[model samples]
Target: GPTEKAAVKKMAKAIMADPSKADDVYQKWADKGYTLTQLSDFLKSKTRGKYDRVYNGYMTYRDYV
Candidate 1:
């Protein structure tokens, strides 16, 4: 199932505020069975281009952590 839109928005806000926190955000959602790919697609659709950079940051950390 998809996560709530509000929750995803909040997570995006957190990432926008602190790109370094992407790892933690990724982990939190991943624990809920949401893969990074799923997250990337959903966020891209929800945010359009607004969070593209932050989403990329999330992917960068996804590989390391």
Candidate 2:
């Protein structure tokens, strides 16, 4: 699933431990037939409710950190 980049700096730090495939992982699903505004759609795809239990907690964002 696509990760919300509100945590970009945290992600950056996390990725530093494993930088090799970071770019491919983040960008492969992007710019493909659609103009993307956010990574939310990619999240929706993988996070789609399956036969197994799942949830999409799309509640309101209280604030941007």
Candidate 3:
């Protein structure tokens, strides 16, 4: 349990450190014609069905989000 929790934390930190990756990811989703709801679905898929919603994908202001 400790290891799994640590792994998740680490992954989240890494992502935040380089939010560009998230922007790039979500941008691609937007370009693909995916709406806000669809973007959440995409993240849910990336998280292996663990996350169903992304709090700050910010598809509208993805550059600053």
Candidate 4:
């Protein structure tokens, strides 16, 4: 069932800020047989609000205005 390795590799490389997490990402998604879409939703739910401020560069848009 590891036939999804390539798709995992491509998607893993496409996302993730830290290269160190590649192994974990590959294992979690590829070896564990998880798809990119599933991984995305999983991560989003796990890290919800984790990047909102830094990503948007503002704690709240009201401050920007």
- lDDT tens digits, residue span 1-65, model 2: 22444343243334445555445434433333222334333323343442111111111111213
Clash count in backbone of candidate 3: 0
What is each predicted model's overall lDDT from 0 to 1? 0.70, 0.32, 0.47, 0.42
Count the clashes in each prediction.
Answer: 0, 0, 0, 0
Q: Candidate 3 on 5-57: residue-level lDDT in tens?
A: 45444443445667656655455445656555544432433446444223354
Best-to-worst order by lDDT is 1, 3, 4, 2
Q: What is the alpha-carbon lDDT for the whole of candidate 1?
A: 0.70
Give me the runs in candidate 1 sitting further than 4 Å from their true place.
Answer: 1-3, 40-48, 61-65
State residue 17's C-alpha deviation in candidate 3, in Å: 8.0
As for lDDT, the candidate ahead, 1 or 3, is: 1
Q: What is the lDDT of residue 15 in candidate 4?
A: 40
Candidate 1, 22-59: lDDT as tens digits = 77887787677765576665565543588886667756
* Reference-based TM-score, model 4: 0.33
Please provide, for model 4 over 1-65, each residue's C-alpha lDDT reduced to its tens digit, 9 standing for 90 to 100. 24454554355444445545545445444456554444443333355664332223211221335
Clashing pairs in 2: none
Candidate No. with top lDDT: 1
- Among these predictions, the greatest TM-score belongs to 1
